[PDB]
Each structure stands twice: as C-alpha cells, then as structure tokens.
Amino acid sequence: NLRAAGPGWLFCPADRPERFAKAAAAADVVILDLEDGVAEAQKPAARNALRDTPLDPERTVVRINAGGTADQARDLEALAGTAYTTVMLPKAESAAQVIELAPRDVIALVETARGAVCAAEIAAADPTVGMMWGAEDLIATLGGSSSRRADGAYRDVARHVRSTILLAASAFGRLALDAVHLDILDVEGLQEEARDAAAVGFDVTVCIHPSQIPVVRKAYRPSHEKLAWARRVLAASRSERGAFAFEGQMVDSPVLTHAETMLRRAGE
Amino acid sequence: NLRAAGPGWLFCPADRPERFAKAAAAADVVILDLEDGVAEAQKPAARNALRDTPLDPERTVVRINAGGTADQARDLEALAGTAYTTVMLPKAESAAQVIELAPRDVIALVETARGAVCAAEIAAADPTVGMMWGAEDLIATLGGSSSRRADGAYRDVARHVRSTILLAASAFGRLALDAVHLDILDVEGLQEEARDAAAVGFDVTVCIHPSQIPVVRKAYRPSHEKLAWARRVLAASRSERGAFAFEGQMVDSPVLTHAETMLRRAGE
Amino acid sequence: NLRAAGPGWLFCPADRPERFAKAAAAADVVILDLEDGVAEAQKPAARNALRDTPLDPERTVVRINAGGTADQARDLEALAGTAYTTVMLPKAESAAQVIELAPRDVIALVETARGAVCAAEIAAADPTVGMMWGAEDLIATLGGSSSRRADGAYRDVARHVRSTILLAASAFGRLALDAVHLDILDVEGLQEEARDAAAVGFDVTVCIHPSQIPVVRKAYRPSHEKLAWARRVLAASRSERGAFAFEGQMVDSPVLTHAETMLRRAGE
Ligand SMILES: CC(C)(COP(=O)(O)OP(=O)(O)OC[C@H]1O[C@@H](n2cnc3c(N)ncnc32)[C@H](O)[C@@H]1OP(=O)(O)O)[C@@H](O)C(=O)NCCC(=O)NCCS
Ligand SMILES: CC(C)(COP(=O)(O)OP(=O)(O)OC[C@H]1O[C@@H](n2cnc3c(N)ncnc32)[C@H](O)[C@@H]1OP(=O)(O)O)[C@@H](O)C(=O)NCCC(=O)NCCS
Ligand SMILES: CC(C)(COP(=O)(O)OP(=O)(O)OC[C@H]1O[C@@H](n2cnc3c(N)ncnc32)[C@H](O)[C@@H]1OP(=O)(O)O)[C@@H](O)C(=O)NCCC(=O)NCCS
Ligand SMILES: [Mg+2]
Ligand SMILES: [Mg+2]
Ligand SMILES: [Mg+2]
C-alpha cells in the first residue's frame, strides 16, 4: 500500500548506505537507486549495501536497471536476498518489460520517446502499480540538450510527456509520480511544481534532496484560501439540488469533488 | 444537421422545464441535461419533464447518464417517449459505450483519463457525430482539485486533453465541441477561449448560461482586421501562381484556405 | 545519409529551376516542391524542370503530392527519370501511404488530424527516414483560420502536434524536422524557434527563404554560455562517480549527455 504513504518520496544512491536511515527518516518513501545515481564501477558495492542495510520494505522502492541490460540481471540477483517487493523500472518502453518483473510490483519510469508512445500499454501491464516520468533522459534520448527554457519552464515536449504519463497512469488506476526538481536550492520552483502536480492529481513528487520533502508535503496541502472555499461550497451544496451558482461560478458534481479532495488532503 | 446550427450551444437541466423555451430561444442548440446538472433525487422528475415539454429535435441534444449505470437505463426508457435522436454520452470511455447507443447519434463527452487515452477509438465509432471534452470531471477523476492555475489558464493536462479531442474528432470528421466556461460573469475569459476555439477549428463552444451565447456567436466571427486581410490575400492570390509573398509572409494553399474559412464564417 | 547534413533545409518550388542552384548553394539540403508551392497548372512544367535541371541527389529531397491523387501518380512517373531517392509525402495519414513509396526513402509530412492520430504507425513504416509536421495544413484541415495567437506563439493544437511528431520520430529512430517559419523577415522569431528545436532534439529546421538558413545554422550551435557550462560540468564529472551536485544542480548521466551533445554540436 504505497498509495497511503505521503507525497514526499526521496531518491538515495544505493552506494551510500550511511544515508539510508536519514533518507528513511526525512521522507515518506525512499527510492534506493541502483541505476543512474550510481556509477558502473560502484554498482556491485551498491548491491552489497542494499542487502547489508535494510530499510522497511513497506516504505522503500528500489530503482533497478533498464530491461535487457546485464545490470538489471545482477540487480535482480541481489534483490533475491532482500525483502523488497517494489521496483522502479527506468527507460520503461513496453508492457513486456514490466511483465517480466513479476511477481514484484513495478513503478514504470517513462523517460524516452518510445516509452511515451507506449505509455498506455505500460500502464495497463499487470505488475504496474505506478508511473513516473523523467525529463532528462527524455531530452537526452531525443538528442536534445536542455529540458527547460531560459525562464525555467519545461520545454513543450516534456510538458507533453508529463500529461501523457498522468493520463496513462490514471486510466489504469495507477499511482502517478511527478519528475524530480534538479535545482536543489530552488524551493520556489519546487513549490510551484508540487502545487500544480497536487492540483492535477499526481500522487507523489519525487525529490533528490531531503531538504525538498517539507516543501513537497506543504505543497500537497491546499492553501488556507482554497480550504475556506472548499468549506463554503460544500456547505452551500448541502442546501442545493443539482447545478447551482456559487460566488459567480457554476457548481456541480465534479466541482464539489474538487472541494472534497482538498479537504481530504488537509485531513490526511 | 447540427453541423448547420450556430456555434452557441447551451446546457439546461432537465428538471427545469420552465427554462426550456428560454434556452431554445437564446441558443443555437440546447443540451437538455439528465446527468450532473440534475441531482439523483430529481432525475425521475427531470425524465418526466423531458417527455412533457418537447423542444425541436433538430436543435436539441439530450445528455444522458454514463454507460453501465442504472440511470442511463432509465434515461433511455424515457427517451423512448420522445422525438430526440441525438444524445450526449458523459464519461465516454470506449467505442462500445457509443455503439450500444445505436441507432441514435452520439456526441461523446470525454472527461476522464481513460476517455482521453481511447479518444480516437471513441471518435471512429459509427454513431459518433461529435466529440466534446470536460475539464472538471477530468480533474476530479484524476484526483486533482483545480482545472485552472492562479491566472486562470487551464492546467497542462486539460490543455492536452482539449487538443486530443479536437484531433480525434477531426480525424474522423466529427463535430468538435469546446468546454464550458464556469465563471458566468467572466465574459472576458469566455471571449478569449471562444476566439481561440474558432481559430483552431472547434465547431461549437458549449455554454452554461444564456448570457454567454452572444459572446460565443461574436467570437466565432473573425475580427475586422482578420477579414480585411482575408480579402486582401485572396484578391492578391487571383493574380498569383503558386507560393508567393504577401505582406512579408509566405502564402500558399492552406493559408488561402484559412482566409476563405474566415470569410465563410463571416458569411455564416 | 541526410542525417549527416546540416540542420538548414530549404524548400524551393519545382517550377522555378533558375533558383535551384542558388537553393543548393545556400542550404544543407534542398526540398524541390511539386506540391503546394506550385499551382496545378504549373505542375507538369515543374515535373519537366525536375528532370531537366538536376541537383545533387545526396542533398536533395522531392516533395511529391499526397497519396491517392492523380498528381502523385504523375510525380512518380516524372521521378523515374531522375536520380532522386528520397521523397517527402505531404498529408501523411497512414503507414500504407509510406510503404507504397518503396523502395524510395520517405520523409512523412504530418499535417492533418488523421496524420497526428496515426503518427507512430507512420514513423514505424519501413521506408520512413524522417517525420515533419505542418502547422498550416493542420489548421486548414481542422477548419480553423490561424495557427498562431496574437503574440505569435503557436496555438495549443499545433504545439501538441509538434511534440507528437518529435516523439513518434524519435521512438523509431527517424529524423525529426521542425515546421517552416512563414514570416520571412522575422529572424528573431525564427531564432527562438530554431534554438528550441535544437534543444529538444529536432535535427532540421525547414526554411522557405535562403536568408533563413544562416539563422538556423547559428541557432543549432549552442550559445557561448551553454558551452561554457558543458565544459565545466564534464570536466567536473571526470572527478566524480555517480550523482553529484554541481553549481546547485543535481547532476548525473543524462545531464552529462546533454553537455556532450552541446559540445558535439559545436564541433559540427
Ligand atoms: C546530489 C547529492 C549527491 C548531493 O550530495 P551532497 O553534496 O552531500 O548534498 P548536501 O551537502 O546538501 O547534503 C546535505 C545533507 O543531506 C544529506 N543528503 C543529501 N542528499 C541525500 C539523499 N539523496 N539521501 C539521504 N541524505 C541526503 C547529506 O548526507 C547531508 O547530510 P548530513 O549533513 O547530515 O551529513 C545528493 O543530494 C543525492 O544523492 N541526490 C540524489 C541523486 C540520485 O539518486 N539521482 C538518481 C535519480 S535523479
Ligand atoms: C448556474 C445556474 C443554475 C444559475 O441559475 P440562476 O441563479 O437562475 O442564474 P441567473 O439568475 O443569472 O438566471 C438569469 C436568467 O437566465 C435564465 N437562465 C440561467 N441559466 C439558464 C439556462 N442554463 N438555461 C435557460 N435559462 C437560464 C434564468 O432562468 C433567468 O431567466 P429569467 O430572468 O428570464 O427568469 C444556471 O445557469 C444553469 O442551470 N446553468 C446550466 C447548468 C448545467 O446544465 N450544468 C451541466 C453541464 S456543464
Ligand atoms: C516566398 C517566395 C515566393 C519569395 O519570392 P521572392 O519575392 O522572389 O523572394 P525575394 O525577393 O526575397 O528573393 C530574394 C533572393 O532569394 C531568392 N530566393 C527566394 N526564395 C528562394 C527559394 N525558396 N529558393 C531559392 N531561392 C530563393 C530569390 O531568387 C532572390 O535571389 P536573387 O535576388 O539573389 O537572385 C520564395 O521565397 C519561395 O518560393 N518560398 C518557398 C515557398 C514554398 O516552397 N512553399 C511550399 C512549402 S511551405
Ligand atoms: Mg533517468
Ligand atoms: Mg462532467
Ligand atoms: Mg502543407
């Protein structure tokens, strides 16, 4: 039940076991990384550390290597000596890549054009429990050079893939995870992203530094002004029958659902 | 031939029959609503109203309840006592949901992640004559809480689904209907939306208040500046062979088509 | 190997053979146009010009007419008398339209809703070596009247299709070609577009005037500021193993790939 954890998930390289406990303490869910966070020469040591420094398997996911690679094979061998049951699959590009990871639960990280093109097949695969997107491998594999424009906003194709993943995940009832914010000190930019992610239905914002978790948790709580409105409209709705105008707005079922969702997030 | 009616379509709850004639007078097409506009407890009375206060079936559509619901069964039973032949299907999620509504004409309202993912299949279904998108059920079903950002623009996933629906509809020659504007007094925002809808090829902007119709109709006629240009380029084109530069712009077939479409709209 | 040619491709109407050598001199690759650049009445003459005034077939593409048209038939007949082996297919709408052009290499120009819906199938077709998108026929066929909003940006549906084609192209290892800039003297607007195109992984910006070519070649060279950063981060990486923080940013494999890609571009 990762769907009950909290929105602040945190990457930690698997070759840094001295930080595992810190990460577990700071975050709702830790993603121990055997992939791009760790250099090739350091992967074997990272795998040893996984086995030798267990976190709670109910709140820890392991990002393994891409399908068909020698590393993934070594990863799955190492995982056989752990109690970890959920993995994150990078460069997820087909349903088959997820299905071969049975009986583990899988979070598919779509971060290539092929993955975007196949997002719905990947989402529908049986072991999938969530979908994440990655802007940086996406731009890298497209042969590009930057995921953001001068003003910091994501370039269109990244914005496009983010929506693609959110819909693919939601269409098949999977968790949706938003991309990492690479500018560590940029709490302002992270706050804006997290608030928007929360508004559109993402379940999680993945973080790369523990200082980011409190920003993400706060961002997933609706503002005082949003909560006041949620309260007002739901109260007025108790006296109405069908569509009605409230504070100049046409309100009915899905709008009341937004209000309920806001109060739910405030409560939990 | 809804195709031949104006762009101003107007929802009216079916449990408000004293407003039917008003709605029919103000709008090009009326959508009598048996779904979210009407509370569950009032649906039977709305169904009775549908039978007892008929509107011109050549300019009226009935939004029924979602596929697989007991409410949709009751709606279709009530529909049997009417002349209405076009229905709007909310939460359209598969070609099958549309096909089972034969022999009626169907406008598919895609307002869920699954709908967006399956948009093209829904558009290609035989009884489909139109596609609409719905931002609020979309966000609600995603688990989100806000369809628009602080400055009022639709969030990315809504913009994405809008374009998805326009393309799916056009690829199969269906009418495309743009989403409702819930801020009733926000004539400014409606105007902005409706002008853009007209410019990209939407056939209709759906309205929730009769005061919105005049705004939509005006927004769908190109501005004086656009029409002057259309006239100029087309005049110039009659003495042209192939691509040519007009007022510093490269002009060929599709640009001339744009100009003709403007003048056609001014004509209509 | 059009992939090894620069990013500056130039359309020239096939009924203007006195400009062929000029085109060839200015551009990296010339696209000789038998479609919309040429009026129907001038097409047979254009076809004679193609035969009578040959360009280097290793650096020339021919845009033929759409699938199923009498004009395409005549285009292919005319082409049998040339050494041209790559064609551009306008209004590309299915894999079948591409496959029937074997054994020639095909750049599929997607510029209709159907094309956008079928983009991945088109890209995957065996003869496809490139995908381009066309904003003006897109709006034209949707029944719209302008591809850009007041401030000059492309409307959403065009931005949507652009990303769609970039992903489809890249998912199947095809060249990705960005859309023409119709405002000839707007070199500032072209610069912005081309820089973004290069940043997200487009291989080509297609031009309609030889004055645009220098702008495009310059835009595909990363700025002094970006190159400075690429040098720094890659130098720093040779001292690191795995993810590291550089100048406040989380850095790992794909980001370093971005840097390498910038330097590769500066080298070319
Ligand atoms: C980028 C990174 C290497 C920075 O290292 P750094 O220079 O040591 O960062 P800081 O100096 O700001 O460290 C601050 C504190 O937080 C800790 N910390 C930083 N990142 C951490 C992480 N991902 N997990 C656990 N603890 C972390 C540090 O250990 C340090 O703790 P301490 O002062 O109590 O000893 C680190 O943030 C990191 O590993 N991020 C994740 C990278 C990753 O996994 N990428 C793969 C997918 S994007
Ligand atoms: C939101 C709503 C309930 C507001 O009702 P309201 O409080 O009466 O709004 P107003 O006071 O501004 O109404 C003004 C006039 O316009 C009429 N009117 C308002 N909305 C109307 C509608 N959708 N159809 C017909 N007439 C309408 C009212 O009857 C009133 O007429 P009158 O003065 O001649 O008697 C109403 O706009 C409505 O029902 N909209 C449609 C809701 C819907 O169908 N949602 C589902 C799909 S999104
Ligand atoms: C738009 C167009 C007709 C402009 O005509 P124009 O008025 O003659 O252009 P200019 O006056 O700026 O010409 C300037 C010079 O560039 C040349 N030139 C302009 N466009 C050229 C082209 N597409 N190919 C080769 N040479 C071109 C002209 O011959 C002229 O050369 P010169 O004066 O050194 O002898 C011409 O640019 C053109 O044909 N563009 C392509 C249209 C097209 O192919 N559309 C279909 C796909 S989008
Ligand atoms: Mg990655
Ligand atoms: Mg709805
Ligand atoms: Mg075209």
Numbering used by the authors:
A (entry chain B), B (entry chain C), C (entry chain A): 10 to 277
Relevant lines from the article:
Mtb protein Rv2498c is currently annotated as the β-subunit (CitE) of the heterotrimeric prokaryotic citrate lyase complex involved in TCA cycle cataplerosis.
In contrast to the previously reported structures, the C terminus (50 residues) is well ordered in our structures, forming an α-helix/β-hairpin/α-helix motif that packs against the surface of the neighboring protomer, capping its active site. The fact that the C terminus is ordered in these ligand-bound structures is consistent with earlier observations that the position and organization of the C terminus might depend on the occupancy of the active site. The CoA moiety binds in a deep cleft at the base of which resides the active site Mg2+ ion. Rv2498c catalyzed the carbon–carbon bond cleavage of (S)-citramalyl-CoA to form pyruvate and Ac-CoA (kcat/Km = 2.3 × 105).
